[PDB]
Design a protein around this nucleic acid. Structure first.
Ligand code: ZN
Lengths: 159, 58, 103, 218, 142
RNA sequence: UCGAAUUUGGGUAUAGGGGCGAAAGACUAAUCGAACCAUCUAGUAGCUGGUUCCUGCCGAAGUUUCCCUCAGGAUAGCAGAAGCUCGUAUCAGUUUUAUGAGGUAAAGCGAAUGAUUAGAGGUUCCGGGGUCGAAAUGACCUUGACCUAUUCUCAAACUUUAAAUAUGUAAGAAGUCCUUGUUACUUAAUUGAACGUGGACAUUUGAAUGAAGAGCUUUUAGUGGGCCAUUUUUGGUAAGCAGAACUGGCGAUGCGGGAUGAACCGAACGUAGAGUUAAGGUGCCGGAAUACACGCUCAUCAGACACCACAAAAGGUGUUAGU
RNA sequence: GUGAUUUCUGCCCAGUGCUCUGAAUGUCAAAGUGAAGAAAUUCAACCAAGCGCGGGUAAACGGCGGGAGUACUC
RNA sequence: GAAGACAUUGUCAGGUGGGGAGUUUGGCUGGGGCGGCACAUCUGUUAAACGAUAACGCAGAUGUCCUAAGGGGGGCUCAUGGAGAACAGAAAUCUCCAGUAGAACAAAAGGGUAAAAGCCCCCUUGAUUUUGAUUUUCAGUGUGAAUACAAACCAUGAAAGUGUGGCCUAUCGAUCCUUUAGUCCCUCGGAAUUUGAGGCUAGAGGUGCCAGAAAAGUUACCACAGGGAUAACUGGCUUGUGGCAGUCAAGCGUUCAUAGCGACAUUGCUUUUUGAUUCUUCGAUGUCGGCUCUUCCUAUCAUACCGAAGCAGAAUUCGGUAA
RNA sequence: GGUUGCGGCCAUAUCUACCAGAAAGCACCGUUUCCCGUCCGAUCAACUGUAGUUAAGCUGGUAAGAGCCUGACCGAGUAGUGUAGUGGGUGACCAUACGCGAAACUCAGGUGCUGCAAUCU
RNA sequence: GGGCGUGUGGCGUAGUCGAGCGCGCUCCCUUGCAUGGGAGAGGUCUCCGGUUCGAUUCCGGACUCGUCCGCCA
RNA sequence: GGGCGUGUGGCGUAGUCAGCGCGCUCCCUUGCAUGGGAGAGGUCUCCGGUUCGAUUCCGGACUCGUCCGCCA
């Protein structure tokens, strides 16, 4: 018959990695999570308690509950034609903070600093990001850079 | 009389007819599943805060 | 399996409310009484003509039964039940396993 | 009793090697892969000629055996048994299956059709690619015309299209002819049973001096 | 439980079955198709272990038949008195509940105990009734 | 076959789960493996057939789970109708930026596991065969193992490495910062946790593009046999074969082209006029150049357009161009 | 049941049936008997036939095997 | 005359009773039947690097086992190889060195584990009580399994801590009925006491066809509703198999590859074999063979004209145009 | 800058073979009455810091060292792959257009950094 | 038709590449309800080719025998 | 073609992750009857895996004996 267990098809997903097996380092236990933090989920195969299901591997969610050794995380799961709210109790070995959130907060504080310093002059702050604009005019010189003519190479076996 | 077993044909079209609407998020989400020792203190903290604000703006 | 004859466990007997000593037995069902309501209804339905009026089970599939231990608190005589997993062999006599001895 | 090779010419399935999930395969028909003067040294045979595929297909082990016998027989008849070194550079590891149907009259009374039609192993084949070498022969420059004719006779036993290319390398090595010549004039090559070991600028100097003494004898 | 179900086709020769609430041991099995379209029927010929009678039953192959639990156990004689054997278990337990055999096995056992061999007795349990089937002699540990 | 176990008239007896049978399930009023008549009875049917006027607008499904379920239902989905609360947003089958996750394609095997070709150098209290040896944990060759440095080839259920395409989250006002209130939680401790008071930051308020209104609720129809094409892919020698993944179609759809055709190419449709085209074509059928230009081919079975209606290995001082 | 005459109808009662004037507690209903109980009731003893034990029966249904040695014997 | 309170008769009770009555006699399925379980589940793979994903796909497994093989703590390091020591050698015990796990962890497989999750020792029962929340399957129902807490009460350790069975992924079961534990609480409805009975909360007795009927056959005497969703003809796709034809040439042929043949390989054709499939037909297309009669194909047996020979003649063989 | 105690990242830190180490600190080292544990005061426990020694541990250095780490326009815009065509080819498969882009190999360089507290010629 | 195996003295039967026994009867010896003993004869190992040095033995082909599977409605 | 069973010393076989009995060959004892004790004898069909260990547990292969292979 068919087989769809709780950890089916999780072979390479829950292998550890090359040459970093063994016990886990103490930074994962010394990291501090608060309610509202945004965290990434990546399971550790060395810890069998508090494991996430294989669906939530690589998923990103929001902390809603902090307990003794675990963290409650909220994920949005697509079921059919809508998203449902899923609450997960995961031990802290299987989560880490999302770095995109702290990058955005750094942008927020630097952006507020720019607005605050330029508010003393009113110099059209222009605080929105802009994407890659087309590159403008330039003059390239041939002083020591005379062009070298290239041609297609004929065919050879090369074995 | 064998028949077709399973397919996922037309399913994404059926889903995207009326969209995959994101769930509605709210200020003050539900406190169910939150730790009872936290909620038991949170009730008294909000009660004291409401009493202090009522006495301030009475 | 093997289960010891005594066990220190919780007793919710309204005076203990703690772990006390318990003597264990195996649960036996006891005889089905007459004048139970289902038995009276079954006898009334089976009287007369019409033959067998209720199903009788045939397609037996299990070979084991779940064992139930009857715990009895030694202080206040209150009784508890707890079930175990399915086992073909069960015993309450404690013949402890010993390790570094011969076959 | 054997099916024609057109039923197994193309690489239609995933590779199916003999393993602990097969456990019952027929042995390959080709068994000898290196022949001629296989114990010859490296600078005995400077010229190398390749029979190389132009198809993406499967070559049967029976066809490999037949082509090996044909090329070996022709070259030993025309040029001597120890004037060349032939090497078969493909190995049949793919296993071919057959769902054997009964050829009796009224077979459908006991056939069951396509139900449970997973096959049984009956043969071995080698999966080759575009520009993959099947045969490689090294010899002296006086046997070019006979090794090209030997490979041309062997090409008839193979399905698909194959090319005969005279390589620019020295023998069965991977350097060019003048590169190997300017390497062997120094002592930084040293012969083995058939191949040659090369000097590198890495490693411990004591080992690099107990081996390869003539290059450091500068 | 004392007894467990099984399928007729799952049964095979030299196995125990329950026929008419008797522990029986099969000597013959034969399956014949009922009709060309229909399923085969199993005809079972078995011998009661205790009494030696021959009992036969035919059933559908898919039907489930009752199967006893038979345990064969090894003991040493202590005495044969009044038709009741007295046996001695490993770890020193003793039973006298077994009745002595009444046939040529019982006669041979009685003569062997009278002339003084150390006799090894095999007694079988099935469905709450107990009997002795065979005896040997201990070649070592005299 | 024809003097009888003969043929036959009339009278009479046996009545329907009953009769009668020299036995065929035969006969019992053209009815018999259970007669005929009336009633229950308009018996039940998940099964077959049919189902009656017009126009307008919207518009499917052959999929999930359970069922003595597999020609049927329930349930979710797809669809319609009625709307309700609001007024440009708590949006998006899309991109960018930042940040995750993955073990396929590829690659690798002088990297682990496993398979595998060939020699070389060593190890014999530490192999086996021969020959020389009184024999010898003797010798000399040879052959096997094991080790060392190489070498050839591989892996759906091998792997150090590792894409492309898909995929999670974030890009603020429900935000940031400052100050200090509550608590029975927590701390050695106004330490922290959570929710707060008061104050400051507004249109470049925090990337792009578009928004066709955004959000919400009730109720109910039909459907729950699908099939085809490109790409990935499984079983099979293969199949207009069987089974999956993503998308687009046909079913449900006409129109121009492919002579012809459900699915291919182009393009989707109110009634008309003018112009321009798509795919396909312009000797004649047939609307449109027997146009222009450079070559090739002469077939005593030429060739002529994707899907598509077939041809291979091997050859040829046929002819052309090359190395 | 077999199917004139003639000539014969062998072996097997284990099984399934059928049949005994055998022997007698194993199974063992209702009524009846005894004990306990305040009673409903519960528990026992006793317990007919038939099963179970013991015989017969194949012109009853039926059945009529293997391994060695030298057709024969084991 | 006989018989006699026995037969008979009436009502209950046990046996016997296809003589008769009523009914049943699974599903999936490359047609059905036999076979198997793909019917409830688990591991790896197919599976196309989120998730999901089929086939009677491949390789296997489950209906158990364990008072320790659960919980806590402490000490130690395994498989293997080398070198040694009386009996003692290939394998008994002891000693040293090397040893990233090449061992072990109940079982199938895959993950995980080295002052441990392994081996040995010490103490125990957290395999306990009370109800909630969450994850997987999913309708976001049930069942099973699991995760993190709260309120107690315990175990262990110096302690931090750890423990709500087994290192993780499988190891299992509704309504009704019976029975057990708890509350010793509620009710027996004219009022009480005591038995008895019925309720509430939590378990057990089991449905393996595993969201859970109580169930043997035959029909060649057969019937009905349907089905080309489905088999037995032809036809159509395919050509494994059957038949026929090539290419290459190790050899046979005294000598000599090819007069005639031709191994090991390999490319095709045909639909006069048999399979495979299920597209059409089940409100019917008359399924053996023979007789009769017409036409077509050529892969030519004979006749016509030729080429080759291991063609002297005769006879024969190979081949061409030829139906 | 050396050393110790507790660490973070967990080989640029590991492994093999040599060489060096002032001061201080670690270490080996001396002892068995007491607590405690062993077949064995070898490990563990306790006592002294006395009798001694850098021999080892430890730290650092060396090696065209093994390994590991970083980079390259080194291989290679190669393999692979998203999209497109009434493109080629009997087919197998392959070119082109708009995009993304490896691994092995080769070469070059490197061989622990650092937090808190104490202490040192 | 195809597949698989088989072939020894007059008969049965043993054969690893280096034709033996038993039975029939030839002779001799030996004696009721007829034996035994001793020396005998007896093969082109089914046939034909190649390998070897020599094939019963190895291989290829042919013959022969014995098994197994096969048409339709 | 498929499924099931089968191989243990000469025979009967049994079995825990090779035993007897009857055969065989000796020796001893005592009839009417005997009996006892020794031995030679088994790669558990074969080959692998698993397991401390396998007759036993599993897989593959051989032999033999069975049972099906039907509707058209
Ligand atoms: Zn108590």
């Amino acid at each position: 018959g068919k087989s769809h267990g709780y950890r089916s098809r999780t072979r390479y997903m829950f292998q550890r990695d090359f040459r970093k097996h063994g016990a886990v380092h103490l930074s994962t236990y010394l990291k501090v999570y608060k309610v509202g933090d945004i965290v990434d989920i990546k399971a550790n195969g060395s810890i069998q308690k508090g494991m996430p299901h294989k669906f939530y591997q690589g998923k990103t969610g929001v902390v809603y509950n902090v307990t003794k050794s675990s963290v409650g995380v909220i994920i949005n799961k697509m079921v059919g034609n809508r998203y449902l709210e899923k609450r997960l109790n995961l031990r802290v070995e299987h989560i880490k903070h999302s770095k995109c959130r702290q990058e955005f907060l750094e942008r927020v504080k630097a952006n507020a600093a720019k607005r605050a310093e330029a508010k003393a002059q009113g110099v059209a702050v222009q605080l929105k990001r802009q994407p890659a604009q087309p590159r403008e005019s330039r003059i390239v010189s041939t002083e020591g850079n005379v062009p070298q003519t290239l041609a297609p190479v004929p065919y050879e076996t090369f074995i | 009389a064998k028949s077709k077993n399973h397919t996922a044909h037309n399913q994404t079209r059926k889903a995207h007819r009326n969209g995959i609407k994101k769930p509605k998020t709210y200020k003050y989400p539900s406190l169910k599943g939150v730790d009872p020792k936290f909620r038991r203190n949170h009730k008294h903290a909000l009660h004291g805060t409401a009493k202090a604000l009522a006495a301030a703006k009475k | 399996v093997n289960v010891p004859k005594t066990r220190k466990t919780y007793c919710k007997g309204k005076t203990c409310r703690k772990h006390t000593q318990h003597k264990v037995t195996q649960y036996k069902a006891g005889k089905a009484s007459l004048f139970a309501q289902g038995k009276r209804r079954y006898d009334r339905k089976q009287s007369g003509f019409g033959g067998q009026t209720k199903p009788v089970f045939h397609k037996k599939a299990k070979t084991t039964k779940k064992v139930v231990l009857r715990l009895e608190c030694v202080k206040c005589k209150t009784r508890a039940q707890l079930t175990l997993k399915r086992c073909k062999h069960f015993e309450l006599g404690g013949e402890k396993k010993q390790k570094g001895q011969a076959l | 009793a054997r099916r024609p090779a057109r039923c197994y010419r193309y690489q239609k399935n995933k590779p199916y090697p003999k393993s602990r999930y097969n456990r019952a395969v027929p042995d390959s028909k080709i068994r000898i892969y290196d022949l001629g003067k296989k114990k010859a040294t490296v600078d005995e045979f400077p010229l190398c000629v390749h029979l190389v595929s132009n198809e993406l297909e499967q070559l049967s082990s029976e066809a490999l055996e037949a082509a090996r016998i044909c090329a070996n027989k022709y070259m030993t008849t025309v040029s001597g048994r120890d004037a060349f070194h032939l090497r078969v550079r493909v190995h049949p590891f793919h296993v071919l299956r057959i769902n054997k149907m009964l050829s009796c009259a009224g077979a459908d009374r006991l056939q069951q059709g396509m139900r449970g039609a997973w096959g049984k192993p009956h043969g071995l084949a080698a999966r080759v690619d575009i520009g993959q070498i099947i045969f490689s022969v090294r010899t002296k420059d006086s046997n070019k015309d006979v090794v090209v004719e030997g490979l041309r006779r062997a090409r008839y036993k193979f399905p698909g299209q194959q090319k005969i290319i005279l390589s620019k390398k020295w023998g069965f090595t991977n350097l060019d002819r003048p590169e190997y010549l300017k390497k062997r004039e120094a002592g930084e090559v040293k012969d083995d049973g058939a191949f040659v070991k090369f000097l590198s600028k890495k490693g411990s100097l004591e080992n690099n001096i107990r081996e390869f003494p003539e290059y450091f004898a500068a | 439980s004392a007894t467990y179900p099984m399928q007729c086709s799952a049964l095979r020769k030299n196995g125990f079955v329950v026929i008419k609430s008797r522990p029986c041991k099969i000597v013959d099995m034969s399956t014949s198709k009922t009709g060309k379209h229909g399923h085969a029927k199993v005809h079972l010929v078995a011998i009661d272990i205790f009494t030696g009678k021959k009992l036969e039953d035919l059933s559908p192959s898919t039907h489930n038949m009752e199967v006893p639990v038979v345990k064969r156990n090894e003991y040493q004689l202590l005495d044969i008195d009044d038709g009741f054997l007295s046996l001695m278990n490993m770890d020193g337990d003793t039973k006298d509940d077994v009745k002595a055999p009444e046939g040529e096995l019982g006669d041979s056992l009685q003569t062997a105990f009278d002339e003084g061999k150390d006799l090894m007795v095999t007694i079988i349990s099935a469905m709450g009734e107990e009997a002795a089937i065979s005896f040997k002699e201990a070649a070592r540990t005299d």
